[PDB]
Amino acid sequence: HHWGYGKHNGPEHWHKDFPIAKGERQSPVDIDTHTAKYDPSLKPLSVSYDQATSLRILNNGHAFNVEFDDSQDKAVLKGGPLDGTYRLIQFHFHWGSLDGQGSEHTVDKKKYAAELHLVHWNTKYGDFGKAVQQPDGLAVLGIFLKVGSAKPGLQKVVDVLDSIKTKGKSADFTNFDPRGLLPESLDYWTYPGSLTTPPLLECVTWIVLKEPISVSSEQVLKFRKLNFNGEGEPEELMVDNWRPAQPLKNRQIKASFK
Ligand SMILES: NS(=O)(=O)c1ccc(C(=O)NCc2ccc(C(=O)c3ccccc3)cc2)cc1
Numbered sequence: 001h002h003w004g005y006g007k008h009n010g011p012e013h014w015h016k017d018f019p020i021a022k023g024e025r026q027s028p029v030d031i032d033t034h035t036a037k038y039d040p041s042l043k044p045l046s047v048s049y050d051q052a053t054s055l056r057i058l059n060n061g062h063a064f065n066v067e068f069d070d071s072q073d074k075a076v077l078k079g080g081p082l083d084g085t086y087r088l089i090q091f092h093f094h095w096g097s098l099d100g101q102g103s104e105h106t107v108d109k110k111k112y113a114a115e116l117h118l119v120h121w122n123t124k125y126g127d128f129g130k131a132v133q134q135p136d137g138l139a140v141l142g143i144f145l146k147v148g149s150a151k152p153g154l155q156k157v158v159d160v161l162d163s164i165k166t167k168g169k170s171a172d173f174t175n176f177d178p179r180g181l182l183p184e185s186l187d188y189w190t191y192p193g194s195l196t197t198p199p200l201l202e203c204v205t206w207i208v209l210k211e212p213i214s215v216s217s218e219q220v221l222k223f224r225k226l227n228f229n230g231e232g233e234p235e236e237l238m239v240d241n242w243r244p245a246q247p248l249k250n251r252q253i254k255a256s257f258k
Pocket residue numbers: 117119128129130132133140194195196197198199
């Protein structure tokens with residue numbers, strides 16, 4: 001009985017195996033744009049993915065991860081609310097069964113069709129495992145997806161999904177440039193939060209971009225053809241793999257713009 005997104009193992013059940021699910025710094029959250037405040041202390045955000053080295057794509061039973069070689073200082077995120085350098089380790093998405101839902105963070109309660117998470121770990125901690133035990137160990141850059149025009153840079157990911165349809169399947173995925181998934185503007189909101197899936201660790205500095213990228217209906221439809229199940233098991237489409245907004249509690253969301 002593993003955690004998941006169904007009626008009997010979904011978000012409302014996670015707290016039993018992962019008590020921190022009812023913690024003081026859980027993610028995602030609804031971003032109330034009128035309550036968020038411009039923060040002059042934020043430094044310019046720097047996304048440097050020019051030397052990014054992708055290696056593989058994997059269906060892990062809850063989403064698919066495009067993994068990167070993070071043994072060297074390549075794709076890094078710095079600046080903004082961050083102190084130091086954070087290295088890109090993987091990206092994945094959360095999406096819905098319908099275009100009207102799918103994102104984890106919401107903006108004035110608005111839900112987008114999907115949300116991309118580019119996961120980075122603080123290099124002061126040596127590696128990802130050590131980083132996820134620190135309060136400033138990770139930085140996740142979140143980007144909303146809306147359905148409209150296709151995103152050319154996403155097509156390479158879409159086309160390989162046929163080969164990793166079920167849980168446990170992986171496929172070589174080299175030379176993918178994540179710069180092709182970024183919107184024009186880097187305006188963002190930021191707040192201290194957590195991993196949005198078990199173990200739900202509270203080690204993340206969230207940076208959520210205000211401008212969503214557009215993807216076509218055809219592209220998101222292919223995301224929805226993936227399976228939560230393993231090969232040869234009853235088919236459960238991989239849709240609605242998002243956690244709903246959690247209590248903001250004692251936190252303030254800061255904006256990088258006025
Ligand atoms: N959706 S999100 O961007 O917030 C998000 C990002 C990344 C992971 C993730 O990496 N989960 C897998 C994982 C693997 C190992 C450890 C780990 O080393 C550890 C586990 C429990 C306690 C201490 C460390 C933690 C998470 C989960 C969610």
